[PDB]
Amino acid sequence: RIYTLRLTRQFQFKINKQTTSVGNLIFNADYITFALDDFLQAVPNPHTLNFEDYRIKLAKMEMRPTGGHYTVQSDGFGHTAVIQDSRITRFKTTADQTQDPLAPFDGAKKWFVSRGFKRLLRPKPNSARTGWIPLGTKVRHYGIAFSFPQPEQTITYVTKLTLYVQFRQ
Amino acid sequence: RIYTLRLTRQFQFKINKQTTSVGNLIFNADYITFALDDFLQAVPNPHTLNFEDYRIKLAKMEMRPTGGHYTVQSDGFGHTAVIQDSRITRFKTTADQTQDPLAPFDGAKKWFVSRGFKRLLRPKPNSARTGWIPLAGTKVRHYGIAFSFPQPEQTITYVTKLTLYVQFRQ
Amino acid sequence: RIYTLRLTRQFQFKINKQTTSVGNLIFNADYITFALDDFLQAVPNPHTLNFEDYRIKLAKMEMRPTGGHYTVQSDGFGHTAVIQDSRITRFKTTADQTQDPLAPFDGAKKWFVSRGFKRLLRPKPNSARTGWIPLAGTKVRHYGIAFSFPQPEQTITYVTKLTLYVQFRQ
Amino acid sequence: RIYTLRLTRQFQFKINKQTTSVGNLIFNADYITFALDDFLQAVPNPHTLNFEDYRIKLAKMEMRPTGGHYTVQSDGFGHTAVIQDSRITRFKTTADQTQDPLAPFDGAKKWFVSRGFKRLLRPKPNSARTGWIPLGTKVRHYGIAFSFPQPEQTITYVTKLTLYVQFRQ
Amino acid sequence: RIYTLRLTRQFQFKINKQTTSVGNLIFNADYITFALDDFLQAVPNPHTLNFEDYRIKLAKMEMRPTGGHYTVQSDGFGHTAVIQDSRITRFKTTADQTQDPLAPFDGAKKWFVSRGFKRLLRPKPNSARTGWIPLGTKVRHYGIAFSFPQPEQTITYVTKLTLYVQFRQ
Amino acid sequence: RIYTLRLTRQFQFKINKQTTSVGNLIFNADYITFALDDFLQAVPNPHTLNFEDYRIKLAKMEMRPTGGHYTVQSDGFGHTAVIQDSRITRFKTTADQTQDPLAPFDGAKKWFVSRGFKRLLRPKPNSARTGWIPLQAGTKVRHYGIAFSFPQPEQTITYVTKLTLYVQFRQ
Amino acid sequence: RIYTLRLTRQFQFKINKQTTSVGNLIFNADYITFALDDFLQAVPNPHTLNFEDYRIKLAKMEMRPTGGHYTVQSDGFGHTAVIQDSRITRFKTTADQTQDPLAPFDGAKKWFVSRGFKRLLRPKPNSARTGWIPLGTKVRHYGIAFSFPQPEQTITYVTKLTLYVQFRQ
Amino acid sequence: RIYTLRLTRQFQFKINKQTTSVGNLIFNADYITFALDDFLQAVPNPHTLNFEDYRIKLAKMEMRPTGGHYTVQSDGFGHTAVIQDSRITRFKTTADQTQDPLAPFDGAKKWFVSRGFKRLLRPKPNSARTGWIPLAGTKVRHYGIAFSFPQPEQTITYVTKLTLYVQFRQ
Amino acid sequence: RIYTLRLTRQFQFKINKQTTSVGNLIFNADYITFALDDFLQAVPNPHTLNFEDYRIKLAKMEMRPTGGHYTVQSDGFGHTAVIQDSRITRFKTTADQTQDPLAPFDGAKKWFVSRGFKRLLRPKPNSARTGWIPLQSAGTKVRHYGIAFSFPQPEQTITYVTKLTLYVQFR
Amino acid sequence: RIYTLRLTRQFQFKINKQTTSVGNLIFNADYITFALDDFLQAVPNPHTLNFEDYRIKLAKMEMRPTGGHYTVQSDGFGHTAVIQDSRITRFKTTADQTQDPLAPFDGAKKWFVSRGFKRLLRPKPNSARTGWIPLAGTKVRHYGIAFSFPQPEQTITYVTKLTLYVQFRQ
């Protein structure tokens, strides 16, 4: 018997207007990781239940523009990629690049800057094989990265993350 | 915090060939009710976990023909209806009916005998208002789905799967 | 304020196998009319409620094969037509015809004998203009839907469901 | 001002089982032409109205199997073709042919023998140019031909023809 | 025998421009409840009929922008949730929230601020079980709540509520 | 034998910017009726053809914005309703309403102000039962009818309206 | 044996802003005819081949806005109509019209001024019956007309015409 | 200037009932090639027109069952594959195979034996690059489409139509 | 740089007619596992190409009826389930079951006996985390799990053609 | 056995506002070619593997507006065309044209300036027939896709992504 718990949190994300080499195409990127404790603030504590292990079965990231940005105002496209190891940490690019850093990655999916994206993924921490983790709740799971060409104007987004967490006795 | 558990069970159902007033249209009906205990045989009891109460959020009934019955073989249509009280029990009538007993009911939906059906429902048992039942508690019966059918010229066997989507609260 | 009441009844219909001029195409037809009293067997008279008038806003006829007839077994096509006057009464044809009697009618819709049909219509009885009839009153005949068919090689039995959408006003 | 009249008639059509060269693929064909008088027998005549001319705007042929033939019982495919002159008459095939006689024709459309077909066409008779004809009603309009590979068993069809006729004063 | 009556009413709704913590993501929410007297006039009226009980079978809320707001103008997304008791009242928030108050709820559905939303629900008042209430018509039914991230500019909406009410003798 | 004639005419319609109770939600409405004479501007009387009766089988109203109005610019929604009697005439509202006057009506359909609408209807005038009206006065018989409501917008919106009549004549 | 040749040409078309009866609805219209020589400027001549006759089987007209016009900017709707004789010429009206001149015509199809339109047609010149013309190439074929309510601002379009021409030996 | 010509021809194809290792899964295959001369039997030669060269831009193969075979009668699935050189000839196949010979090939697409298939392809013969062939020239063989199938329990007859879309330029 | 190789093999599978508890509903099940060596007999070992590791990114199982079985002949439904450990091995049932053994499993998907099924999965063998396995071959024989499928026992025997597809990555 | 590799690169493309013959319709065009070395870097690299040959099975070009251009702001339509030899070079037009230079071409596909386009193609370099090239080598240029456009009233900037689907064999 597997019990499932859905958790969610939100935050703002900004893509800043291009200020260097204006008129040329440059890319940047960022990334998101997942830990059960990131989502256990407004929620009672699972350890008080007689569950032995938990597993992050599925995660969802949805980032959509706000601040009055026009969806019909084109700002190019970047990519999203599911990267399931610590290597993802290098994708909060400190320097601008001339090429999209995530387009070459396995399973890279295009997304349009002015419309945002929604993507499902299976983030990864016997645990190494199945993902079942003893209750622990701070174990980092990787992960989703997203790239973008730098736009002419700053764009603000609302990001919602959703965890689909499994528990077994 | 709401935890969700999916449970399922299956069984055979048979619509027997018409042997009475053959050549004329007659209807019968049957029904299904839901209790958490119906689904807790291969599964430990959730109260061994420190859950306070449970609620049957959703139920699904899918009944599909087997035994070699042809789906393209027309055997008319009956109806399904969600009936959320003990009154549903009156619907497996020992005697045949001349009219479809469920067609008049609120939310009745047609189904073709040779195809079967799939239907979702919210079966119902302060608990009387919310549906939360303390974790004998697992045996509270929830109602309910009835299904009617015109009697066919030949017997039809079905595979039925029931699914419970059960909520547990901390 | 308009209150709506949905009523339904079912019956068997049969298209008999062709026995005359076998091997040639012949057509027959039948028709259905609607009266509130046809549907009030299981319901008290709405006049016991303080309703003054009623109106048959909409009617639905669904006729689907049964008796094991194969839907993939081709038996040609006839037509359905909404006929809102006494002329419809001539369409329970006592004699066979060489042409489809309903195909020429305004709004005629093709239907395949082996599949049946479903059709909505607005049957017709200040009453003459609006359809509002004082609540005798429940027996006013409303017309109407006719359906034609080429005579098949073998007898086909159908289950017919009729639905009335009846309006009542305050 | 154009007034439109819809006329229809039906008849049985039969494709006989192959009795020659059994086991080999052969094709035959037939055709249909349209004249207003073909459809006016059960219809009060337009002659009684003060219309000057008529024109066959559109014609429809629908031929569907009957006699208990199974639609899932495959019997190959032939073609339909719109042929707008007297040449069509040669397509009531006297002799079996080794190739589909209509497949090469302009606008030929496949149809499956066990399903039948539905096809719209603009049959053709200043009248030669526009189609307007003085009220006359026996002018022949061409036309639709249909071919078929000869099946192993006889198949009977119900055929409905529909005329969409325009009238002007 | 069940007789059905459809009732409807409309009103304006405003999401005010963000004036606190400007530049940061904050959420607010509101809610709607349903009483038959919200929709009824003195004429015509079901009380004058001989019905014994009524039941709100279904309710519909549709809220759509007006005032010239651009639908292609992105303003993020909030959530709707069906809440079937008086607790819903705590979602008319006086204090702004850093997290979406309805996203965690069972059955929460995303909606985009600049688009509005349409949602069906079964609001709740043996009456507690079936919903049948003696005619009375002031009984309050719950309920639908909706959240939103505070936008940069005020947005005005047209809201239509619809009740599908059943009556029995 | 039924002969069908399709007729059409167009005109401009305007919803004026709200000038009363500005900032609050108010509704207005208007309506359209149909007479064969409305559409026979350029066609001889069908009676000169040997037709005896006519019947308005179907009518269509399509109203779409013009004047550069943005379809993506939201201006709320009103309703359309088919009203087949003289009661429709009261929907040329001289006074503003706080509620949508057509939303409660049987068959009311929502439409978005910034998009316009298209709707089919069967307008109504033995004639009372069937709709067949003698030709000769007959062509001026008014048929009812479609009404449409709207919340008053912040700015004036101009529309193009096309009406289409599907008229039957029998022998 | 029928050989087919596809030819295409483009040009600019303009609907000028309304200057007469400003504030009121007025209509205008224009039209397009087809001759093989209109399309043989950058293509070798077919008579160098041993083709006896040619026939314009199909024509396509596509007119789409340019010059930065917003497709979401409503400017009403007009109609297109296929008119297969020389009378089509009367539709380039020197005077504005109070009604849409093409809406009454058989087969008229609505088109929205701010989106443009695309339409297929069979333009018309034994030749009158079939359309086969001896190679001749200047024969005029009619034709497609399009009407429009006059807009508040000028709208520029790109028009592409395509001919599908048949040749037989 | 490019002129286009559509040509077509038909023939019967049969998949014989399994007679070897009956009860076990075995595969066979066949193939089709294209030459303009295959399609010019009822057509004059384009060189009588002053065309210099031709090119097969596109080819279509459609093979559909006949002889009364039931499309709902499951007989497994094989594959089709476009193979653009003479190696296509290697699927004779003189010996039955235990594996589907075309499933591994690039671009292989599944087809169900009881339904047949339709597929478009670009068959291939400066000419080696462009495909333009001077107008013996009409006999250049273009490759090609192969199709495999698991051997059925009963013989299945098909009608096959090939279509050529040939370009000619001045 | 990731290089992808698609490999496929086929075989026959049979569901035998019910001979125990005839007239009652019983279920059985079977399962499939994946090893690169199961698909690499015609192809030389990818280690002869200068590849160091391989990883089974994706696997597909498609099982469709043959032997003349009618797709319109109903024979109920079972389930498929992705099981990524040794537990799958117990699902070639030695005994008939009164309940569907795979219906309770995470991600179980219904399939109809008379139609067959098609399902994609990610079968599982730093290798334990990522799936990258060294080439040498012991590596190419590492068993990956896995897909199990259950079925109600039918009244007559049904034969299927099964095609397995491996999507293998090399770096 | 065929191993497949996906490669991608991006760059900015710009259609400049019209400055000549302002007010009249004129066309210009450009083109893209493909070489494996356009997409490769010094490490990792295919040469270090024991592959005999490679070939570009498929290429994809996607060009989409950026810089804040409104997709709903109409700027007409041009065409894309696959041109598989060096003649394509003549389509980076130095002089403005009154007619669309690619619209007459075989397989020309319309595209709207304000929306951009996505197109698949088979670019071309026994090698001339099949595309297989020995690992010249990775520098062989493959042709090719050209795209035309009516000159707009304002400058439009695009992001372009090219994708190569490369096959390798031992």
Residue numbers in the entry:
A (entry chain I), D (entry chain C), E (entry chain H), G (entry chain B): 46 to 170, 189 to 198, 206 to 239
B (entry chain G), C (entry chain J), H (entry chain E), J (entry chain F): 46 to 170, 189 to 198, 205 to 239
F (entry chain D): 46 to 170, 189 to 199, 205 to 239
I (entry chain A): 46 to 170, 189 to 199, 204 to 238
Give the article text.
X-ray diffraction to 2.0 Å enabled the atomic coordinates of the 10 nm complex to be elucidated. The assembly buries an extensive surface area of 13,650 Å2, of which 60% is associated between monomers contained within each pentamer, and 40% buried at the interface between the two pentamers. Monomers within each pentamer are arranged radially around a central pore of ∼7 Å, with Tyr115 exposed at the surface of the pore, and Val117 lining the inner surface. Thus, in the absence of DNA, Cap preferentially forms 10-mer complexes, where the highly accessible ARM domains can mediate nuclear localization and DNA binding. Understanding these complexes also provides a platform for the delivery of novel therapies, with the decameric structure representing the smallest viral nano-cage, exhibiting highly desirable properties including a charged interior surface capable of binding small interfering RNA sequences, and exposure of the N-terminus providing a plethora of cell specific tags to be engineered to direct viral assemblies.
Each Cap monomer was comprised of a canonical viral jelly roll built of two, four-stranded antiparallel β-sheets, with sheet one comprised of β-strands B, I, D, G, and the other sheet comprised of β-strands C, H, E, F.
